[PDB]
Amino acid sequence: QEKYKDVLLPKELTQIGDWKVDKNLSDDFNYTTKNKKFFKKWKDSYTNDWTGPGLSHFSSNHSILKDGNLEIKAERKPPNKVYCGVISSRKEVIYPAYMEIKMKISGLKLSSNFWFISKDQVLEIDVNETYGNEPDRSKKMGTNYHIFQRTPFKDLTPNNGKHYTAKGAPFLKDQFHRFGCHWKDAYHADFYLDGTLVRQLTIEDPRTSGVGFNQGLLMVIDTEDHDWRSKKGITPTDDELLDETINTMYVDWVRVYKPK
């Protein structure tokens, strides 16, 4: 069907210069299995041995290659936990870059995620987070950034979450959409939904050393049970996890472009 190279960049990016592919962080995921080429670019784990948030248990076995998609799976981990698929890049992205995934999010209460995090887990850009179950929120591209204090764990930049509907406000679970980030410099990023600009972000860094987003970030493609939800009693049921209609997040392609 579709290769990521044939899809035009947003006019806003082409107004700025020519762009080339970073092949190490781009994949059509058209492999029939997790082969040598898959493992050259990707690891079928999180960036470190964190097993994940809330009732999440990150699982190498919950990422599948099938029929031109990376499929991100979820299964009951008895008694009350959720095996969550996760892949992350071996190579880092630094500004300026355009990072975009084509995905059909799950229909589960888990978050369907395309994000970036520095090795030391300080710097986080959320290009997309969506809860697939939500009558309203399943329609919303969820964009955010976080600068974390690690030792006494604290978000130094909470409440930066902004939600955007696609044109016509469809349920995002019903079709492939593109979730894009133009990371321009240490303090600026533009977010794009289906190639259209939805957010002009300026980063506010309150750290002693306000250098902003100046580190290499690793790509993460995952699904997660978020603790604030499962603590409110919002978490997939057994029948939901088994419902082949809603239990899978599909990634047709991911791409990362650099100036030429």
Q: List residues with catalytic annotation.
A: 124, 129
In the list 193, 252, 254, 256, the residue contacting Ca ion (rule: CB under 5 A) is 252
User: Residue 84: which residues within 8 A CB-CB, separation 6 or more?
Assistant: 52, 56, 57, 58, 59, 62, 72, 74, 110, 222, 223, 224, 225
Q: Least distance from C-beta 100 to Ca ion, angstroms?
A: 13
Total residues contacting Ca ion by CB under 5 A comes to 6
The H or E element containing residue 39 is helix 36-41
Tell me which residue of 248, 227, 230, 235 sits closest to 62, measured CA to CA.
248
* Closest distance to Ca ion from the beta carbon of 69 (Å): 6
Burial group, residue 53, by CB count within 10 angstroms (0-12, 13-18, 19+):
middle
How many angstroms separate the CA atoms of 48 and 46, rounded?
6
Which region among 6-14, 30-38, 93-101, 184-192 touches Ca ion (by CB under 5 A)?
Answer: 30-38
In the complex, minimum distance from the CB of residue 29 to Ca ion, in angstroms, rounded to a whole number = 5
* Stretch in the footprint of Ca ion (CB under 5 A) among 24-32, 136-144, 153-161, 225-233: 24-32
**The pair of three-digit structure tokens given for residue 206, joined into one six-digit string:** 């309150």
Stretch that binds Ca ion, among 65-73, 151-159, 161-169, 216-224 (CB under 5 A): 65-73
CB 56 within 8 A of CB 40: no
Question: Is 44 one of the binding residues for Ca ion (CB under 5 A)?
Answer: no
Among 22, 26, 68, 155, binds Ca ion (CB under 5 A): 68
Report, in Å, the least distance between residue 198 CB and Ca ion: 24
26 makes contact with Ca ion (CB under 5 A): no
The rounded distance, in Å, linking the Cα atoms of 65 and 245 is 18
| Binders of Ca ion in range 77-136 (CB under 5 A) | none
Q: What residues line the site for Ca ion (CB under 5 A)?
A: 28-30, 68, 252-253
